[PDB]
Write a protein that holds these residues in place. Sequence first.
Motif, PDB file in Angstrom:
ATOM      1  N   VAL A   1       0.924  -1.307   0.000  1.00  0.00           N
ATOM      2  CA  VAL A   1       0.134  -0.186   0.013  1.00  0.00           C
ATOM      3  C   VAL A   1       0.750   1.275  -0.183  1.00  0.00           C
ATOM      4  O   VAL A   1       1.904   1.330   0.769  1.00  0.00           O
ATOM      5  CB  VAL A   1      -0.781   0.020   1.224  1.00  0.00           C
ATOM      6  CG1 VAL A   1      -1.873   1.009   1.395  1.00  0.00           C
ATOM      7  CG2 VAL A   1      -1.823  -1.324   1.291  1.00  0.00           C
ATOM      8  N   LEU A   2       0.547   2.190  -0.865  1.00  0.00           N
ATOM      9  CA  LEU A   2       1.362   3.303  -0.806  1.00  0.00           C
ATOM     10  C   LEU A   2       0.507   4.577  -0.515  1.00  0.00           C
ATOM     11  O   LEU A   2      -0.457   4.897  -1.212  1.00  0.00           O
ATOM     12  CB  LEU A   2       2.101   3.639  -2.039  1.00  0.00           C
ATOM     13  CG  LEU A   2       3.118   4.797  -2.124  1.00  0.00           C
ATOM     14  CD1 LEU A   2       4.499   4.467  -1.205  1.00  0.00           C
ATOM     15  CD2 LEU A   2       3.578   5.275  -3.735  1.00  0.00           C
TER      16      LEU A   2
ATOM     17  N   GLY B   1       6.269   7.040   5.327  1.00  0.00           N
ATOM     18  CA  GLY B   1       6.749   5.834   5.587  1.00  0.00           C
ATOM     19  C   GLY B   1       6.646   5.820   7.211  1.00  0.00           C
ATOM     20  O   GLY B   1       5.447   6.168   7.749  1.00  0.00           O
ATOM     21  N   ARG B   2       7.574   4.839   8.119  1.00  0.00           N
ATOM     22  CA  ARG B   2       7.310   4.786   9.243  1.00  0.00           C
ATOM     23  C   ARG B   2       7.537   6.086  10.081  1.00  0.00           C
ATOM     24  O   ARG B   2       7.812   7.099   9.701  1.00  0.00           O
ATOM     25  CB  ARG B   2       8.490   3.577   9.879  1.00  0.00           C
ATOM     26  CG  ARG B   2       8.165   2.317   8.957  1.00  0.00           C
ATOM     27  CD  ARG B   2       8.651   1.155   9.827  1.00  0.00           C
ATOM     28  NE  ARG B   2       8.873  -0.129   8.622  1.00  0.00           N
ATOM     29  CZ  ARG B   2       9.379  -1.203   9.141  1.00  0.00           C
ATOM     30  NH1 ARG B   2       9.911  -1.537  10.286  1.00  0.00           N
ATOM     31  NH2 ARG B   2       9.547  -2.029   7.957  1.00  0.00           N
TER      32      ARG B   2
ATOM     33  N   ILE C   1       0.652  -3.738   3.775  1.00  0.00           N
ATOM     34  CA  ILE C   1       2.026  -3.552   4.092  1.00  0.00           C
ATOM     35  C   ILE C   1       2.385  -2.334   3.454  1.00  0.00           C
ATOM     36  O   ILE C   1       1.917  -1.782   2.270  1.00  0.00           O
ATOM     37  CB  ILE C   1       2.866  -4.376   3.029  1.00  0.00           C
ATOM     38  CG1 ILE C   1       2.673  -5.964   3.152  1.00  0.00           C
ATOM     39  CG2 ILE C   1       4.388  -4.118   3.158  1.00  0.00           C
ATOM     40  CD1 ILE C   1       2.994  -6.565   4.790  1.00  0.00           C
ATOM     41  N   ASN C   2       2.893  -1.395   4.313  1.00  0.00           N
ATOM     42  CA  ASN C   2       3.410   0.059   3.968  1.00  0.00           C
ATOM     43  C   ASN C   2       4.337  -0.109   2.952  1.00  0.00           C
ATOM     44  O   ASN C   2       5.688  -0.356   3.458  1.00  0.00           O
ATOM     45  CB  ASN C   2       3.772   0.973   4.982  1.00  0.00           C
ATOM     46  CG  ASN C   2       3.789   2.376   4.550  1.00  0.00           C
ATOM     47  OD1 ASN C   2       4.131   2.759   3.549  1.00  0.00           O
ATOM     48  ND2 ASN C   2       4.078   3.520   5.587  1.00  0.00           N
ATOM     49  N   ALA C   3       4.581   0.033   1.532  1.00  0.00           N
ATOM     50  CA  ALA C   3       5.331  -0.005   0.614  1.00  0.00           C
ATOM     51  C   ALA C   3       6.456   1.136   0.697  1.00  0.00           C
ATOM     52  O   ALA C   3       7.514   0.955  -0.084  1.00  0.00           O
ATOM     53  CB  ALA C   3       4.604  -0.038  -1.005  1.00  0.00           C
ATOM     54  N   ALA C   4       6.224   2.016   1.506  1.00  0.00           N
ATOM     55  CA  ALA C   4       6.996   3.216   1.468  1.00  0.00           C
ATOM     56  C   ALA C   4       8.728   2.678   2.232  1.00  0.00           C
ATOM     57  O   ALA C   4       9.574   3.254   1.826  1.00  0.00           O
ATOM     58  CB  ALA C   4       6.697   4.494   2.527  1.00  0.00           C
ATOM     59  N   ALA C   5       8.513   1.640   2.954  1.00  0.00           N
ATOM     60  CA  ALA C   5       9.639   1.015   3.598  1.00  0.00           C
ATOM     61  C   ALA C   5      10.571   0.395   2.623  1.00  0.00           C
ATOM     62  O   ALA C   5      11.835   0.389   2.711  1.00  0.00           O
ATOM     63  CB  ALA C   5       9.262  -0.151   4.517  1.00  0.00           C
TER      64      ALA C   5
ATOM     65  N   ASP D   1      -0.011  -2.159  -4.845  1.00  0.00           N
ATOM     66  CA  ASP D   1      -1.255  -2.926  -5.204  1.00  0.00           C
ATOM     67  C   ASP D   1      -2.453  -1.930  -5.077  1.00  0.00           C
ATOM     68  O   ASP D   1      -3.326  -2.109  -5.462  1.00  0.00           O
ATOM     69  CB  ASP D   1      -1.389  -4.055  -4.283  1.00  0.00           C
ATOM     70  CG  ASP D   1      -0.370  -5.202  -4.475  1.00  0.00           C
ATOM     71  OD1 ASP D   1      -0.336  -5.457  -5.850  1.00  0.00           O
ATOM     72  OD2 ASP D   1       0.388  -5.509  -3.534  1.00  0.00           O
ATOM     73  N   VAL D   2      -2.172  -0.857  -4.088  1.00  0.00           N
ATOM     74  CA  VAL D   2      -3.116  -0.122  -3.455  1.00  0.00           C
ATOM     75  C   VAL D   2      -2.491   1.606  -3.596  1.00  0.00           C
ATOM     76  O   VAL D   2      -1.663   1.572  -2.930  1.00  0.00           O
ATOM     77  CB  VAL D   2      -3.821  -0.307  -2.174  1.00  0.00           C
ATOM     78  CG1 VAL D   2      -5.034   0.759  -1.599  1.00  0.00           C
ATOM     79  CG2 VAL D   2      -4.373  -1.741  -2.234  1.00  0.00           C
TER      80      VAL D   2
END
Length: 270
Positions: A145-146, A160-161, A175-179, A200-201
């Motif tokens: 997910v972004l 991100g985090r 899942i946070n894709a920014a990681a 994906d999102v």
Amino acid sequence: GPLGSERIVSLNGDITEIIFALGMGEYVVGVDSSATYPPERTKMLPNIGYQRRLSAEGILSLNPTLVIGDEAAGPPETLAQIRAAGVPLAITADPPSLDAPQQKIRFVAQALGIPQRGERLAAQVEAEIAAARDLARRITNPPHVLFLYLRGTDVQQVAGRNTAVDVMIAAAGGINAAADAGIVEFKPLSPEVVIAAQPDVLLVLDKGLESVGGVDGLLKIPGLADTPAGRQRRIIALDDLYLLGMGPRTGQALTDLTIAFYDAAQGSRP
Ligand code: HEM
Ligand code: HEM
Ligand SMILES: [Zn+2]
Ligand SMILES: [Zn+2]
Ligand SMILES: [Zn+2]
Ligand SMILES: [Zn+2]
């Protein structure tokens, strides 16, 4: 016997929402720019400036009996003038945590002298968060997910985090894709970020999506049309206070995210 009449100036949109959720909205006399819930009620109230750029004179001229806010309220020099004027003031923490809703609710309830109403609201919010997390446990193939912060085509930032949105994505079973791009807090969107995230999102704000021309404009941003999200037009747009406030609607926002993420887990790839 004697009854005073409370005049509350609330410094942050999420604190304001919580005062109204506790039943005490009729005592609010002034709100900040970010206070958009309940919108029918807060549009009628005097503006004291944005939560991080508060007007001391705008607050004090409302003759408050109480000023309440959380750690986002500022600048410090405005808080200092509130103290120097002798107006009661309290400020609470607002960590990026699923414990923040309950903590802020108890803080407001104590200031307003209604700790029982506060326990009832916190117990309900925690139950709604629990229910969304239970739905999120069905996800065995979690989607990438972004989150994009957008302010026209000029401004494109990824979270991100150590952010509220990071906490919301994870608890909803995404899942946070920014990681994957190494991102801590807010960082600019780039070709490189898009290659590494391939979400994906796409998660955006209502206003942000409007500021780029809707889904059609967003997907004109280089790289986004060809992500797995871009290809299926899997864009989730939520109101900012609703998604990111960490307030009484946190469980409702988690449920909307996890429902969407579940669908993406099934349908995005292959
Ligand atoms: C994720 C948290 C944030 C939210 C929900 C948020 C939301 C908003 C909103 C609703 C507006 C006004 C509407 C518009 O721009 O069209 C705005 C404007 C703005 N935002 Fe943010 N923002 C956030 C984070 C940030 C951060 C971290 C910065 C700076 C480092 C920033 C800088 C600005 C600026 C400079 C404006 C324009 C002010 C003006 O034109 O009068 N924002 N943002
Ligand atoms: C529920 C979350 C948030 C909402 C609803 C929200 C709403 C807004 C709005 C309406 C504005 C425009 C204010 C103006 O231009 O005078 C704005 C600006 C801004 N926000 Fe937020 N905001 C949020 C969270 C955040 C966060 C998390 C940050 C930083 C980490 C941030 C930093 C800023 C900054 C720097 C501006 C530009 C205005 C200024 O510097 O005083 N905001 N926000
Ligand atoms: Zn009182
Ligand atoms: Zn807050
Ligand atoms: Zn990844
Ligand atoms: Zn819903």
